[PDB]
Amino acid sequence: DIEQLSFARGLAIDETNDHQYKLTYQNLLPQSGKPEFVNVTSHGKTILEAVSDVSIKDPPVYSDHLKVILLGEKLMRNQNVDQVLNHFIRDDELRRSSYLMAARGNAADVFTKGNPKIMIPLRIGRASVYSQNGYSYLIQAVKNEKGKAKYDGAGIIKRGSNKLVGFLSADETQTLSWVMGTIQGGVMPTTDKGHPITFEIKKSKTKIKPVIENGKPVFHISVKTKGILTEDQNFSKSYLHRLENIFEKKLERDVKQVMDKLQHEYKTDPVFLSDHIRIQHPDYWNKVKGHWDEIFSETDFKYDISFKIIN
Ligand SMILES: [Cl-]
Ligand SMILES: [Cl-]
Ligand SMILES: [Cl-]
Ligand SMILES: [Cl-]
Ligand SMILES: [Cl-]
Ligand SMILES: [Cl-]
Ligand SMILES: [Cl-]
Ligand SMILES: [Cl-]
Ligand SMILES: [Cl-]
């Protein structure tokens, strides 16, 4: 859509009736005894801020940087996030280590006045490099659950557009992270014949072996996890092998559901599976590079999950 032209900028600075500063920028109307500069094509941005007499009097002595940037859902769904950050944030407001996060719903509502991970956490350094290099990726999500902020899964940012195409739940994010080997800790609660059993992760490792057969890739994923157990009803021997099997099968069916959403609902690989075929199969990679998501959707997965209780 076409907007009216303006080549010069002006600024109004006011103090309002409810005591706050209001800066209204102005897009000055191009001119061909009256005050001509007053005419605008449109008003520009407005800045609202409460500032104390002491803060007008005492200027800042150094340039600080943003620690965390939280992006609202509607913004991420409609706009290239890299382009947005570039447009609104000066490079010197950010550091490599500044955190980037996603909000379900409105981001401003997630920040709340005081009382009295792991995704991964994504830092600006990495997120920007992902965007620039055509990678889909995950960003930790937060939600104001009435509220009370709370970590709540992950946003899925798709390559090219750099837009959020959906969210994974906390459980789905844990499952995906577990199978991919990026998980640090966590618990899997389930049941054995109705009795609650929980498996707490101590150490987990994943090996991924992609094999092309034929024209499409087949990812052989191996998951080895050691953990602690919690019980109800009430040692072993085969009984631990039995519980291990229950936990193993659960992870498998849970990851199948998540992978199905990635392949056929969202149609993107936000966990760098692409990198494994790049290392193991450069020639094949060279041919598919330009349409990896298409290939990802057609890809098959074979899991080998092995749990070990040490409690
Ligand atoms: Cl206009
Ligand atoms: Cl400005
Ligand atoms: Cl104030
Ligand atoms: Cl300061
Ligand atoms: Cl929305
Ligand atoms: Cl890092
Ligand atoms: Cl959808
Ligand atoms: Cl990575
Ligand atoms: Cl191509």
Side-chain angles (χ1 to χ4, degrees):
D1 194 282
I2 307 173
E3 294 74 39
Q4 184 175 359
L5 295 170
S6 166
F7 307 100
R9 276 167 60 248
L11 174 61
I13 312 184
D14 283 299
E15 175 169 0
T16 65
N17 297 12
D18 53 23
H19 287 208
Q20 58 201 184
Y21 294 98
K22 189 171 79 163
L23 283 69
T24 310
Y25 287 79
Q26 310 291 160
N27 298 126
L28 305 181
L29 188 65
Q31 178 185 345
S32 62
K34 300 168 186 176
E36 219 83 326
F37 72 83
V38 156
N39 297 114
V40 302
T41 57
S42 70
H43 302 112
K45 69 184 169 190
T46 296
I47 306 185
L48 287 172
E49 189 173 22
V51 177
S52 73
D53 288 353
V54 173
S55 65
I56 289 297
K57 172 183 174 175
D58 300 318
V61 296
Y62 84 109
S63 298
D64 72 333
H65 294 71
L66 293 170
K67 304 304 166 202
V68 54
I69 306 294
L70 184 63
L71 304 178
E73 179 173 354
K74 181 172 175 164
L75 178 140
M76 293 187 293
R77 285 185 185 276
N78 298 141
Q79 307 300 337
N80 183 315
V81 301
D82 188 82
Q83 291 180 348
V84 171
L85 292 169
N86 179 71
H87 188 99
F88 288 107
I89 308 178
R90 298 161 48 77
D91 280 24
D92 64 19
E93 302 175 60
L94 295 170
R95 292 187 167 280
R96 178 188 296 275
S97 65
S98 301
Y99 297 103
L100 182 65
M101 301 210 170
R104 293 167 179 269
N106 173 276
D109 292 1
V110 176
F111 291 99
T112 56
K113 278 188 263 285
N115 312 27
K117 63 179 169 292
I118 295 179
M119 266 308 322
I120 181 160
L122 187 61
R123 295 171 192 269
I124 279 295
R126 284 189 164 261
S128 189
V129 164
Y130 295 157
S131 300
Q132 297 173 242
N133 292 226
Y135 284 93
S136 290
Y137 58 95
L138 299 176
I139 176 173
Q140 178 66 59
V142 299
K143 182 169 180 278
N144 204 22
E145 304 184 11
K146 289 75 67 181
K148 210 62 54 55
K150 180 158 170 54
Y151 289 113
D152 193 19
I156 307 165
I157 311 303
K158 189 165 187 160
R159 74 226 318 151
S161 67
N162 224 5
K163 294 179 180 184
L164 177 148
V165 296
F167 290 93
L168 292 182
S169 63
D171 285 346
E172 287 168 337
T173 306
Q174 187 183 57
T175 298
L176 194 53
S177 180
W178 197 321
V179 177
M180 297 302 297
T182 53
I183 194 160
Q184 199 72 6
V187 295
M188 175 188 289
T190 189
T191 54
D192 174 30
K193 293 168 169 276
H195 302 298
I197 55 176
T198 297
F199 180 84
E200 188 186 20
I201 299 172
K202 273 285 190 166
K203 198 168 189 176
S204 189
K205 303 182 175 185
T206 288
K207 285 188 174 298
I208 301 184
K209 184 176 186 180
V211 180
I212 291 65
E213 46 176 30
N214 285 241
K216 329 296 161 51
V218 175
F219 280 95
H220 285 79
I221 299 187
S222 183
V223 176
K224 290 186 171 186
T225 313
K226 295 183 174 180
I228 298 184
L229 181 155
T230 301
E231 257 275 328
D232 278 306
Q233 258 75 185
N234 317 125
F235 313 95
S236 88
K237 312 285 82 57
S238 301
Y239 163 78
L240 271 42
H241 281 113
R242 186 168 160 281
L243 287 180
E244 287 166 358
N245 198 57
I246 295 179
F247 295 125
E248 285 159 16
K249 284 183 165 185
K250 174 165 171 50
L251 186 62
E252 183 164 37
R253 79 180 87 98
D254 291 346
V255 74
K256 281 183 177 179
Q257 179 56 285
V258 177
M259 204 58 42
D260 195 73
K261 293 166 71 69
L262 292 179
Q263 285 177 296
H264 311 294
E265 190 184 0
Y266 306 117
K267 303 180 179 176
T268 202
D269 158 24
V271 289
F272 309 92
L273 273 309
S274 54
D275 288 339
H276 293 275
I277 68 174
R278 175 174 57 78
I279 300 171
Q280 274 64 293
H281 299 284
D283 290 343
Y284 182 84
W285 175 239
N286 190 219
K287 184 185 169 183
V288 301
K289 272 163 66 171
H291 50 276
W292 166 243
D293 282 344
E294 182 188 354
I295 293 295
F296 173 69
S297 292
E298 303 166 6
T299 302
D300 296 32
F301 297 84
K302 300 291 186 297
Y303 306 88
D304 184 332
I305 307 183
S306 181
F307 278 37
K308 288 167 284 180
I309 291 78
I310 63 183
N311 190 200

